[PDB]
């Protein structure tokens, strides 16, 4: 029970930019649904990462995140609702792209408590042999 | 006194990504020296930014950072493990750990750490920083 | 049940309807009836609420998440100010006072300041924007 | 005192663009403490929801004029303005206001508020008849 | 479920005394959670200032009714130094210190104190409470 | 010192309009600390519930005169939603929310909210305040 | 549970000795929760100052009768240095330090302290407690 | 600085009115730090219960005379609801709530509260305070 | 229950040796909670300063008997540096440090230190404790 | 620099009274920081239990002398309910509650309370303090 | 489930120091699996150690760590930026950041970080860990 | 006003081990005296480090520490007394050595307050062309 | 219960080596709660400084025998033993004791104490006449 | 000045000298006279003190650091136990109670438990080990 929502606003993006947004949406769907095959198809095997689970280190490879796919609750236990706020997409020539957005996640905590979480995400995509892959992402949370 | 040091340890970088590292070094130099002219020369005027000064929002433009070049009142900035991924011919992405050694109220030494991602785009033959993302992890 | 408090007087016939429409809206919220809610709310509604964490959200899905989760409550509208905007605009602002039961068997009262902006689209009034605040 | 709008890379229609410009002039009169321009842009019977009102709804200019008369480097930034038009005489603009300033010490601090302003075209001119300021925790 | 009124020394006038009686009946309907007597003693458009209203002024019975619908035997209220000021033939203003005794979660005796001002209006020969103000000092 | 009153809606009767005006003059006399005007508007044996009384009920004018003589510049009192209920011909009861904008120890503006209930009694053709009740939430 | 007086030095007169014995019987009815014995020794219009009154002065038997109808074992109350001043034949005033030893929630022995001042009035040949004042030092 | 009494309702007898006036003169000598006027109104062997005694009962004038020789402007003491009970011709007992308004370290106005119980004895035609008890509620 | 005594150095006179022995028997009667032995060793009008008295000075046996009847297995009392000073022929004063090893609520051993001063008076040829003073640092 | 002793009611025997006097002189030498009078009233091999000794027993004058060498006008001590028990012809044991009043860093009046037990021995016809025990409750 | 991952990013190691990394991986595996036989095979019996379990003291021998192999009651250990400096023919020194992903009381995920230095000595043709130094920096 | 003291105990070390101890002493003397030339002579220009000033990162090169030589108070202001506790030296063939010890430092704080600091140090030495150099050190502090 | 000594890579003289072995036997009797071996290795008039004594100096075996009689996986490690001999009948051994154990939960905890034991050769056998246990903060 | 407290009795002539030597040692400490201190203390003295942070230190330099830094104090020795060890050993243990003035003008008292071990080296007694503890 999870669905990903984007809201660009009145602004209409480039068709290319629109595809980067759609791909990012698919990736987030892989993460919330914990489908590691779909995640792996969209992400480069040598992706560098900056996330709070890294404790200020930079991590490389898929295994660090495959830990979260193979573990953590399945997804049946609870329901989630992620939302992408103001996605800014900057194309970098023909083979690069950089999408940065605010991620707002609605869910249920330990009890039947509804809570909202905000994180700031930067994802860099590289067009490798006609296929866009996520080569680096950087996820922070405000204090 | 403001100096900037990179630490590539044993790995070897290509000339392109070595230049991305060099440009990032100059950028952070203009930051620590509060030289906004050089900073403006290295940064695209429509630059997006994620930083703790923005309170979890994404800001655009130069005025938001030019505020800090003004108004604000001996440090060593160190770039740790610069990962530079080239993106075709007009893209580049360098992520690193920014370690800052400095002085407190007294002659007291303290170190701060932030994780930075900077995205460079080659616009009309020159490299410009079009987006950066600065984080500080659970202190 | 919901209680309105105009204090004194009767509003004009146009803004009285805005008050009643707000009553039906809050009724759909408290009763968790999403059909009436979707009928009263524009599909591209912008929103400022504490559940949005200082962000502005748009669409119904963000709010429909709250309809699909979770008996006796008493909401009360304090000093409604309705300002009409031509023939196709209306802006109602009021203080929402809610009475309910928390985790234990103890009664609690919550206060929030709500500002709803209604638009008359093709003869029917729809809420296109609302702004919910909570004082500290 | 400099004010910057951030539409994203979008262009609004000619009608709502003026709502954006007028809002910038309003925030300008607020930051510069110029009550004359403020009074020209605001209806005298303006209802208001702001943290200075302590969860109450205030009306009139006197409550706000109290703030123009006290105290003499700031940078306000308008994040994601949404303008929904209401016929020919109504407009509703909502945005996130991001303020950079200097506090008691010489330290830069940033504050974020959410603002929703409702404008009414009264006799060919636009006046701000309602506004709602919230602050996230 | 017994309410004690403490006139201190000396005796007031009879008309003030009846206002005191009606206030007692009101608080009895409150501690006994008897909404019928409460509705008999209270005007349907009563204004109220109480800590449950969060610095707002509430009107009507539903705001207090809600409280009567939800709760359940052991209470004791005491009216401290009631001042009753008559207002012509149709007005009355009684103000007093309310002292309530009860039992919380665990079996320990606790006492709460509030300051109350109740305003009675003589409508059609009967007295009704048209406004009350409940405060608590820190 | 400015005392502003706002009724959300409706016109009061003439009598209760006067009750509102008399309350306004009273609050003015408090802010200006003119004890002669205050005493003219208030009964010499007025009972009172206010935070300065520490949950006690005080009577008389001296308890309040103490504040008139020792306090001893610019403040803004706003009166929100006055509910006036007349009691026959010789009684009246007005209850309202009071907002106070002022400057504290700093150069920073602060707002204070209190809920007030005043009871007026007409004696010999003159309305006097005989009891008031001020609480803060 | 039993109560113990501590006269320390010197011997009191035959009048004040009875005041101390009656105070002992009173506190005995308090610790044993026997309201009958308490009502025989207390005037029905008794004023009271106690921490359970929150700095107010309550009147009547019911304010204290609420406490008799709550909780059931072993306690030890001691009257430290009773000072009895007689006022003619119909007045008496005894002030003392009440020291209580008991068990709380856990299994521990403790010693609470309160200062009590009781005023006795001889009404129709019997001594009655018309006012008591309970204090606690910080 | 001046002291104000609040009799509220009713009129006291001619005897107890003098007890209240003498209490006013006493607290006046306290707030003005005039030990001469204080010594004229207080018996030299006065017992005392006050928070400055830490729950003990002190005797003599010097224990309080220490406070007269310390600190120098504007204060306001009010006697709330004085209850005076006469004991023949040579005894009197007044209990009241003392409410003090003053300025602390910073420039702020405040209202401290203490409960006072004073016992007056007529010794050779003059009334003297032989025992006072100062309490503070928490 | 074991009561151990240790003098760092020196031999006491015969009298003060007996004073030490009587104190030992007293502490034994407290630990074993044998009130008959305690009463035999203590004056019926004994004054006392102990933490159980809350800074007051208590007199008599009942105050202490309360603890004999309600407490109601293995503890180790060690008496450190007894200073005995005889006062003529009918007085004596012994002061010492008392260590107590025991088991509290847990299965963990805890040690308690208290400083005690006992005053013995010989009445009719029998030594009785007439005053003791127990403090804890 | 004045010490007040409070015998409460009634009068003790003369021999106990002199022990009280000598205790007063001792504490005067303490508050006045007069080491000569202190040395005249105290045996050179005095044992002591005081909070300054940290749960240890100290002996001799140097431990208290040290205190007399270092410090400087405003103090007031009061001896509460002195119990004096004579021990034959050469022993005496006085125990009491000491109540001290003074001024700390800022100009605020403060009161401290300690429990003291002093043991006097009649050595060569004069009384000397051979052991004292200073305690403070929490 | 216990796995161990190294992250050499772009740099290239020699076969010797690559084997030092491999041996360290096996060592940490025997730690997370609490397999003391393998651990003893990789560790010299007179090994010195600095670790927070030692409270600022330096311990020697195996019994101090064998205590933790006993008595103690799904994790991913990751070796970050392994710097391996060879010391002639019989010495080696590998220092790295040890990042540990694991589960709390609930199915709650948490990450811990420690900095480790391990010194290897070639004794009779086999490599043994003769000294290690484990630190945890200002959490 | 600073001097470095070693105390091996009754145990006598190897002559080689003794030299490693002496070299370590010289290095610490360079640090306390803030003589960067003497420090640089004993330390390898590509030394890796683990110290609390690195915030859980590993640092390489001299500049990170030359920051502390060129800044910080000179050394004239106060007096220091460092002490090396139980130095354990393990030789690694002919070209490696590993010395680990407890560092106890006595000094004066902000006021005239004497304070003691303990840190645990591991220093690795490499014999490069007949000259021992410090190639890695690891300094921790107990909690 | 296993005990490990850590001389560093040194060998003591034959006389002090026995002091080390005997100390190991003493700590063995302590960890195993075997009072018989303890009493054979310890002089009956042993003075003692330990945190269980609350800064006081205790003497005898009873104070320590109290601890052998209460409670039934531990690892003690002796760090840097210094043995200074005193003629033919005295010896002073001081060391750092490092203890690994399990607390209330199933969590491993480590404690560190500093111990100084003074042995005396009494009639050809070595007895521990004094010990001093400290704990750093 | 320093005060000894044998409580009662006189020690034997051999251990009395150990007590006096301890007095001279503490005198050199309080007066910060390092010459007498070095004369009374063996150059290879082991030490357990709170200034060593749970470590055992050896030598005079660690203590000489404290002689070269920083009027009226009163130290007192409580219940000294002196146990002789043959002809060339002695072990004295005692409670040290120190009276002094802190930062302000207020008197403070500190307590520590000291255990000194003396050795007769070539006819003269030297302190070869001492162990200073502080109770919490």
Residue numbers in the entry:
A (entry chain F), L (entry chain F): 331 to 473
B (entry chain E), K (entry chain E): 331 to 403, 409 to 474
C (entry chain D), N (entry chain D): 333 to 402, 408 to 473
D (entry chain C), M (entry chain C): 332 to 403, 409 to 473
E (entry chain B), G (entry chain G), H (entry chain G), J (entry chain B): 332 to 403, 408 to 473
F (entry chain A), I (entry chain A): 332 to 403, 408 to 472
What does the paper say about this structure?
Ca2+/calmodulin-dependent protein kinase II (CaMKII) is a Ser/Thr kinase that is particularly important in neuronal signaling and cardiac function. CaMKII has a unique architecture, in which the catalytic domains are linked flexibly to a hub domain, also called the association domain, which forms a dodecameric or tetradecameric assembly. We reported recently that the activation of CaMKII-α by ATP and Ca2+/CaM triggers the exchange of activated subunits between different holoenzyme assemblies. Our data are consistent with the idea that the CaM-binding element induces the hub to transition from a closed-ring form to a ring-opened lock-washer configuration, which can release or capture dimer units.
The hub domain of CaMKII-A crystallized at pH 7, while that of CaMKII-B crystallized at pH 4.2. The N-terminal α helix of the CaMKII-B hub is preceded by a 12-residue segment of the variable linker, including several acidic residues. In the structure of the N. vectensis CaMKII-B hub at pH 4.2, this segment is ordered in every subunit, and it folds back to dock onto the central β-sheet of the same hub subunit, extending the β-sheet by one strand, as seen in the structure described earlier for human CaMKII-α. The acidic sidechains in this segment are located close to the acidic residues in the hub. This particular configuration is unexpected, and is presumably possible only because some or all of the acidic residues are protonated at the low pH of crystallization. Comparison of the N. vectensis CaMKII-B hub at pH 4.2 with that of tetradecameric or dodecameric hubs shows that the linker peptide cannot be accommodated within the grooves of the closed-ring forms without steric clashes. The assembly is distorted at each interface in a systematic way throughout. This leads to the formation of a spiral, similar to a “lock-washer”, with a slight opening between the A-B and M-N dimers (subunit notation is indicated in Figure 6D). The segment that is bound at the interfacial grooves in the ruptured N. vectensis structure is not the CaM-binding element, which was not part of the crystallization construct. Instead it is the C-terminal portion of the linker, which is presumably accommodated due to the low pH of crystallization.
